[PDB]
């Protein structure tokens with residue numbers, strides 16, 4: 001996206017400084033561990049699309065009078081932006097261990113690299129630690145300092161709670177607990193808060209917008225947005241052309257609590273529920289195709305197509321009603337970019 | 340200890356409130372995960388001696404004029420005390436995963452309990468999250484609020500760095516990297532900071548003692564103390580009568596970077612180093628006894644006995660020189676209790 005593609009180069013260049021600062025030796029004793037930290041950051045914070053991190057910068061630009069966007073201010077925006085990317089990094093290193101994943105972004109998951117293993121648990125925590133070190137270094141003197149600390153801490157809590165909810169929901173194959181109230185709730189805590197609310201809110205705080213009604217309004221928009229994109233993500237998992245997407249979907253084999261399956265569960269006859277119990281989770285693809293064919297049989301696409309349309313109207317309506325005092329274009333810019 | 344045994348009952352009773360607060364449902368959607376959180380706290384924060392947590396309370400009593408030790412103040416001290424215990428809990432859940440431990444306090448490690456597994460990684464992070472939730476709830480309006488947030492965050496960073504250092508130092512059997520500079524450094528980051536500096540410093544902050552020279556002095560004492568007790572702990576591992584201690588030592592089988600082995604390495608002839616390479620790490624006890632007998636051969640006890648004596652004089656000297664403006668008895672009280 002133009003506004004995101006504009007900001008990107010300078011953002012990703014800043015990562016050099018991030019690492020320099022975080023690894024910079026009045027204490028020689030810890031050199032080796034600091035070396036290890038460099039390895040961990042380089043491997044794990046680098047390679048994504050950086051949509052979350054960039055949203056901090058784009059929003060900051062949109063939210064501050066340009067007279068007050070000096071050298072120092074953007075440094076800070078880049079830093080706070082990278083703080084989000086470290087939070088994501090923390091989450092994914094650990095998620096990959098917990099899920100017993102192999103690949104992450106088409107490359108070997110860190111914990112699987114020869115000689116890392118469960119040491120990766122410590123590594124994940126180091127990534128999280130780095131957030132607060134960066135906040136102290138670049139923002140301790142700023143009025144929004146405490147607000148960001150609390151915002152990040154809270155964002156972690158909410159995600160971990162959501163991860164708990166997901167882990168409870170999807171151990172052992174049981175669809176009885178794959179409700180829509182429960183799906184809506186996993187998505188909200190585990191992805192929407194830190195993926196959609198956090199980056200904008202850090203920018204709002206950075207720009208002196210600290211009021212609770214302001215934040216509540218931003219949140220209301222951003223969470224419903226987050227819900228939409230996860231549902232989209234779940235749709236495209238099975239039906240998206242993977243050359244378009246990037247992912248090759250495995251939510252059926254993985255036994256994940258997908259939007260698709262929740263909907264399928266509200267619609268299936270007792271006969272079909274049995275067919276679902278029969279096929280959801282297996283490696284072998286003859287079973288996997290029996291799930292997709294069931295969904296298709298239930299015209300779940302049309303259900304989705306319907307969901308999208310309703311959702312478009314709801315979202316635009318919320319932005320109308322709740323974006324100001326912020327510019328509509330922070331919301332729209334992000335939507336543009338995540339779609 | 341009288342001063343610790345005095346404070347204990349009320350402390351441990353407070354844990355009921357901790358849990359009530361941390362699990363208390365305008366959102367019914369997350370009930371199940373909150374339930375899980377209760378299970379995690381109950382299992383993991385309970386059962387230790389609580390020396391770290393209690394040190395916050397004892398020190399608070401020692402450090403505040405009693406006119407200013409109202410109902411509310413102690414609530415807060417209990418809470419901050421429990422924050423330390425949660426930090427320890429976070430560390431140990433994760434350490435046990437990383438070390439592939441079975442038992443912790445003579446009971447099954449959490450991650451080994453049927454149905455937890457690597458979900459424990461999330462659980463560990465929840466324990467850490469709880470620290471900042473408690474700090475917000477009980478101390479957001481207090482002047483020391485930010486100081487404690489930063490103190491806890493920093494304490495986590497230092498420990499994780501130390502854990503990195505330990506993981507690098509003791510993968511694969513190699514004594515070449517078991518130096519004394521390196522031992523002294525692991526102990527400092529991984530145990531001394533959060534076990535000795537953190538609890539006193541939280542109390543200092545709580546009592547309005549925020550100055551850097553004040554804290555630097557406390558730190559100087561408390562780190563050297565921490566070094567002493569870890570070395571003691573390493574000694575008693577092999578030589579302590581385990582009915583006295585509580586632990587049955589396995590630092591030789593576990594291949595840990597013990598004080599004992601570092602010293603043994605500075606003393607061994609090329610002949611004996613070979614005997615050490617020969618026996619350090621094995622399950623079988625004929626090998627394990629060949630290590631103990633080597634240490635004995637090197638009169639490592641007398642070396643230790645010597646270390647203790649020197650260390651006593653050094654510590655008392657530091658307290659003389661650096662305790663005031665604080666009462667000597669916060670240092671001494673703690674020493675009394677950890678020995």
Ligand SMILES: O=P(O)(O)C(Nc1ncnc2sc(-c3ccc([C@@H]4CC4(F)F)cc3)cc12)P(=O)(O)O
Nearest residue numbers: 090091092094095159160163190191256460461464
């Ligand atoms: O296919 P994945 O990408 O692995 C997906 N997971 C997620 N997706 C988008 N955001 C988050 S945030 C998240 C997460 C958060 C916290 C943690 C653990 C607690 C911690 F941070 F240590 C682990 C994973 C997972 C997670 P799935 O597991 O639902 O299949």
Ligand SMILES: O=P(O)(O)C(Nc1ncnc2sc(-c3ccc([C@@H]4CC4(F)F)cc3)cc12)P(=O)(O)O
Nearest residue numbers: 225228229305308309311312313315316335336339
């Ligand atoms: O490929 P597309 O042209 O994008 C088509 N998409 C749609 N088709 C019919 N109605 C809607 S409404 C819609 C939409 C809804 C919400 C949003 C984002 C959340 C928001 F409102 F911010 C963006 C686009 C897409 C959409 P397909 O992807 O289903 O093939």
Ligand SMILES: O=P(O)(O)C(Nc1ncnc2sc(-c3ccc([C@@H]4CC4(F)F)cc3)cc12)P(=O)(O)O
Nearest residue numbers: 305308309312316331332333334335336337338339
């Ligand atoms: O024939 P098409 O136009 O390609 C049709 N698509 C749509 N139909 C009716 N409304 C919308 S709105 C929409 C859309 C809206 C927003 C966006 C991005 C977020 C934004 F507004 F910037 C992308 C696609 C597509 C879309 P289909 O392929 O589903 O048959």
Ligand SMILES: O=P(O)(O)C(Nc1ncnc2sc(-c3ccc([C@@H]4CC4(F)F)cc3)cc12)P(=O)(O)O
Nearest residue numbers: 121122125429430431433434498499502529530595
């Ligand atoms: O015999 P153990 O008790 O397991 C001993 N370990 C420790 N001892 C006293 N304090 C700490 S603090 C600590 C630690 C800190 C951080 C972590 C990981 C980073 C995290 F918190 F996730 C794991 C363990 C271990 C640790 P050992 O592993 O040296 O044998």
Ligand SMILES: O=P(O)(O)C(Nc1ncnc2sc(-c3ccc([C@@H]4CC4(F)F)cc3)cc12)P(=O)(O)O
Nearest residue numbers: 564567568644647648650651652654655674675678
């Ligand atoms: O059983 P014990 O009587 O305690 C005997 N202990 C000692 N023996 C000869 N010198 C010293 S000097 C000493 C000592 C040193 C430092 C400290 C703590 C660190 C401090 F200074 F705060 C406490 C006691 C113990 C100590 P043992 O345990 O070796 O059998």
Ligand SMILES: O=P(O)(O)C(Nc1ncnc2sc(-c3ccc([C@@H]4CC4(F)F)cc3)cc12)P(=O)(O)O
Nearest residue numbers: 644647648651655670671672673674675676677678
């Ligand atoms: O014949 P013992 O007295 O039992 C002799 N022990 C000691 N010898 C010379 N200084 C100290 S100082 C000391 C000691 C000091 C402090 C403490 C706790 C920390 C305190 F000061 F409160 C415990 C023991 C023991 C101790 P041993 O058993 O090593 O032969």
